[PDB]
Design a protein around this ligand. Structure first.
Ligand SMILES: CC(C)CCC[C@@H](C)[C@H]1CC[C@H]2[C@@H]3CC=C4C[C@@H](OC(=O)CCC(=O)O)CC[C@]4(C)[C@H]3CC[C@]12C
Ligand SMILES: CC(C)CCC[C@@H](C)[C@H]1CC[C@H]2[C@@H]3CC=C4C[C@@H](OC(=O)CCC(=O)O)CC[C@]4(C)[C@H]3CC[C@]12C
Ligand SMILES: CC(C)CCC[C@@H](C)[C@H]1CC[C@H]2[C@@H]3CC=C4C[C@@H](OC(=O)CCC(=O)O)CC[C@]4(C)[C@H]3CC[C@]12C
Ligand SMILES: CC(C)CCC[C@@H](C)[C@H]1CC[C@H]2[C@@H]3CC=C4C[C@@H](OC(=O)CCC(=O)O)CC[C@]4(C)[C@H]3CC[C@]12C
Ligand SMILES: CC(C)CCC[C@@H](C)[C@H]1CC[C@H]2[C@@H]3CC=C4C[C@@H](O)CC[C@]4(C)[C@H]3CC[C@]12C
Ligand SMILES: CC(C)CCC[C@@H](C)[C@H]1CC[C@H]2[C@@H]3CC=C4C[C@@H](O)CC[C@]4(C)[C@H]3CC[C@]12C
Ligand SMILES: Oc1ccc(-c2nnc3n2Cc2ccccc2OC3)cc1
Ligand SMILES: Oc1ccc(-c2nnc3n2Cc2ccccc2OC3)cc1
Ligand SMILES: Oc1ccc(-c2nnc3n2Cc2ccccc2OC3)cc1
Ligand SMILES: Oc1ccc(-c2nnc3n2Cc2ccccc2OC3)cc1
Ligand SMILES: Oc1ccc(-c2nnc3n2Cc2ccccc2OC3)cc1
Ligand SMILES: Oc1ccc(-c2nnc3n2Cc2ccccc2OC3)cc1
Lengths: 367, 367
């Protein structure tokens, strides 16, 4: 029996104080508070969300890219758990976590207003946000699945928040197929030699692709000039992670350049600035396309090229080719813990952004 | 000659990469990058904003609470600068900063669309946000003015962002006057003895006032139940700082309680939880009032009481009574650098929130 304005503010205050409590626990942990205390806290929050989901289901009883999105990242998370399962907080957390993931997908697939529902969904938003934060701050198969569990817990947090926020074609695919074959070659050569040559190859390949995407998107923008809020916000919020990764690399490269060090190399400076520029241009192209016969064929070739390039760029870190963690300079300017966390944020965000863009470019291409 | 959607996204991307660059510099500094490099970076950004403001002015040539808000906090900032003025980056920064503050107030008072204006205002938003972040991370008069320069640089950042986001009465004043006289007594007694007794007095006084405000706001909510977006967002965003301060204190108090330490005291646990509860209740009361004869007199007495209590609570940290920095427990669980930064965020946010609430309660009272 609350006014809607009070139901929304009270739910927001509950959720934000839940986040700030998680923040307090994480700060206390890094500085009395042990890993078991943070795991126990989030485990309890998952148990609370599970109780809400069960009660909700009892009371109740072109999105294929999004449903297949979280179903794949949840299956990958369940695989990760299965590996971890096979202190009390460490022993219990993966069980509650697996149940949380299973119920979270079941609910979002089939059961996606009262104050009960608003508190439930806000709780879920900040539970998944805290799960992201924990995945980022805290056998060998757990390495490759790491970005997929983290992007699972940022995707689902967005999926839950935005739910209530609302409430001829020749050159394109040829360039795309070449970029994909080259990306696969870079991926396998890098993994086989897991060395320095493969890293340099990776960065030169990256620069070449980022420059080609800048040209493609710029051409599309010129065509539009001479002649959906959530998609823009999701592209920008996700790309911010990669823009921090890039600015950290740029700052470290400039700091090295200022000393006239013999180790300075343009491949760690031009690439990061190019990543920021290309993403700014692509974000503007994609949103312009979403707010909209030679021009049609040109735009289709551009979207097909960018689509394929974004898939190839998603593929690189998605399959284990993440050399940024081993950078000899960024791990000295910021240290290993800061560089590692910045990448732990940026990489799963970069995977999200590179598959978001692929879905938006696909839609633009079809129409 | 940009579409409005592209003008807004491109400006947002410029501003956010400006923030992420400032983030990169601050991380690099804490971990190659010295204080002079961060001061130089922000000094240059202030010079850029000054150039924009001059070009803009050349091209061009119930808000009294807000205009008097930033005019007072800018005069206090100029006083702080005057004290600092009387490495090259340290010598130059206060001059550019003073000019920035003077032009920022001149512009906001008298000169508060083209892409030029959008890039200019977004730059100013993230320049002031970076200035806040620097004031928080990095004679004796500089102590007392510290929260006012920091809240200046968070107030003005909000003032600039929201600009474009938009584009009978017996018991009340008697309780208020008693709360004010008691707050002044606590303030002067604390400062005179600048000791442990004054701190305990402060915390017991705080708890007594927070409980009285909870009763007042709860009564007002009951009256409304038995019978403006930016204001809600500013109250919540500002109160978040105090909710982090409170949860850090609560976590430290619980960690101490879990060890059965003889030093555990309820005054550091009940107060922080009460601060969170009272603010949640008051935020819901104020927004309910903004979205709206015995009931009228009751509501006027409640608003008058809360108005006076929020002034008294603003007065306590505003005049130097900030004992939270000396807490013997929160500075051990989180360390001195983390507890100090959490308070450097929360206190100027608490001052903002406690004068925001006073302006909203004043408006509600008059009508
Ligand atoms: C962007 C929104 C949605 C918030 C999500 C991220 C937060 C949960 C992040 C932001 C800043 C993070 C903190 C930033 C700073 C620190 C201090 C740092 O402390 C040290 O490592 C100090 C080491 C020493 O000197 O002993 C460790 C990480 C920690 C606790 C981080 C934990 C998680 C925080 C609160
Ligand atoms: C919301 C946007 C517009 C603001 C930009 C900043 C945020 C996106 C924050 C939230 C998550 C933060 C990161 C999360 C955690 C850390 C941990 C911290 O590293 C450590 O945990 C250990 C410190 C050490 O011992 O070196 C360094 C800061 C960093 C990378 C933070 C950098 C700033 C981030 C990206
Ligand atoms: C909320 C939005 C609007 C962003 C505004 C705040 C950011 C500018 C904050 C968020 C997290 C902050 C960082 C969090 C973590 C660190 C790591 C910390 O590093 C250490 O102290 C490690 C010490 C050591 O182990 O040697 C110092 C502060 C710093 C750089 C902070 C600098 C400023 C950051 C990026
Ligand atoms: C946007 C909301 C909903 C997310 C909640 C977190 C944010 C509000 C961030 C931005 C500013 C952050 C703070 C800014 C800086 C620091 C510095 C850091 O302390 C240090 O600088 C030194 C670390 C050490 O050596 O102990 C500890 C984290 C803390 C308090 C951060 C805690 C989390 C805050 C409040
Ligand atoms: C559209 C699909 C691909 C979505 C994401 C699924 C990902 C996580 C799957 C796809 C195929 C998998 C890879 C194929 C085989 C190898 C070689 C081995 O030595 C290390 C693991 C590794 C490298 C696997 C890791 C996980 C993997 C990358
Ligand atoms: C509405 C007004 C008050 C807005 C804010 C102005 C503030 C910053 C002004 C008001 C009066 C001032 C105080 C009055 C006198 C003293 C005693 C001296 O030993 C330390 C400084 C100190 C404690 C001053 C600090 C700054 C001050 C707190
Ligand atoms: O056949 C597939 C299906 C999905 C993915 C995938 N994996 N992660 C993500 N998606 C999809 C997605 C959809 C919308 C917005 C963002 C986003 O990014 C997350 C991969 C292969
Ligand atoms: O990989 C990503 C990263 C960020 C977003 C995103 N973009 N806008 C929003 N989020 C997420 C979010 C989550 C919890 C609370 C607030 C909040 O803010 C809304 C999406 C995908
Ligand atoms: O450099 C970055 C920048 C942003 C993130 C990030 N990822 N998810 C979230 N943010 C913060 C954010 C930014 C805009 C809107 C909402 C929101 O909240 C959730 C990470 C690294
Ligand atoms: O006579 C005065 C006038 C202003 C202040 C003051 N000082 N700081 C702040 N204000 C005012 C204010 C107004 C609207 C929203 C927030 C807010 O908070 C900032 C004090 C005495
Ligand atoms: O003391 C405060 C603290 C926060 C707010 C506030 N509330 N909502 C917003 N801000 C400020 C802001 C500043 C820069 C970029 C984005 C942004 O987000 C909007 C106000 C007063
Ligand atoms: O515990 C806290 C929580 C928040 C802040 C803070 N202060 N100013 C800003 N935030 C972050 C924020 C939160 C909501 C909307 C915008 C926004 O951005 C600016 C500080 C301490």
């Amino acid at each position: 029996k609350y006014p809607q304005k009070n139901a929304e503010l009270l739910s927001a205050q509950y959720g934000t104080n839940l986040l700030l409590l998680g923040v307090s626990v994480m700060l206390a942990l890094a500085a009395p508070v042990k890993e078991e205390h943070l795991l126990s806290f989030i485990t309890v929050l998952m148990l609370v969300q599970l109780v809400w989901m069960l009660c909700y289901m009892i009371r109740r009883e072109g999105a294929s890219w999004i449903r297949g999105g979280l179903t794949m990242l949840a299956l990958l998370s369940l695989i990760m758990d299965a590996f971890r399962i096979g202190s009390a907080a460490l022993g219990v957390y993966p069980i509650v976590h697996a149940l949380h993931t299973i119920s979270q997908v079941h609910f979002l697939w089939f059961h996606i207003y009262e104050t009960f529902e608003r508190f439930g969904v806000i709780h879920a938003v900040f539970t998944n946000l805290l799960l992201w934060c924990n995945g980022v701050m805290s056998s060998t198969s757990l390495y490759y699945l790491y970005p997929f569990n983290i992007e699972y817990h940022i995707f689902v947090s967005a999926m839950l928040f935005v739910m209530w926020k609302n409430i001829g074609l020749l050159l394109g695919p040829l360039g795309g197929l070449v970029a994909l074959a080259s990306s696969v070659s870079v991926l396998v050569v890098y993994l086989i030699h897991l060395h320095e040559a493969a890293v340099s190859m990776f960065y030169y390949y990256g620069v070449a692709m980022m420059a080609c995407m800048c040209v493609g998107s710029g051409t599309g923008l010129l065509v539009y000039r001479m002649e959906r809020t959530l998609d823009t916000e999701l592209l920008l919020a996700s790309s911010l992670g990669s823009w921090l990764m890039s600015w950290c690399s740029v700052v470290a490269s400039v700091a090295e350049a200022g000393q006239k060090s013999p180790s300075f190399s343009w491949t760690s400076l031009t690439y990061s600035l190019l990543l920021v520029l290309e993403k700014c241009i692509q974000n503007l192209f994609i949103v312009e396309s979403l707010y909209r016969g030679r021009k049609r064929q040109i735009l289709k070739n551009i979207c097909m090229f960018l689509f394929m390039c974004n898939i190839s760029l998603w593929i690189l870190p998605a399959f284990g080719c993440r050399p940024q963690y081993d950078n000899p300079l960024e791990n000295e300017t910021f240290g290993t813990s800061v560089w590692t966390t910045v990448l732990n944020v940026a990489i799963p965000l970069n995977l999200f952004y590179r598959m978001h863009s692929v879905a938006s470019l696909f839609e633009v291409f079809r129409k």
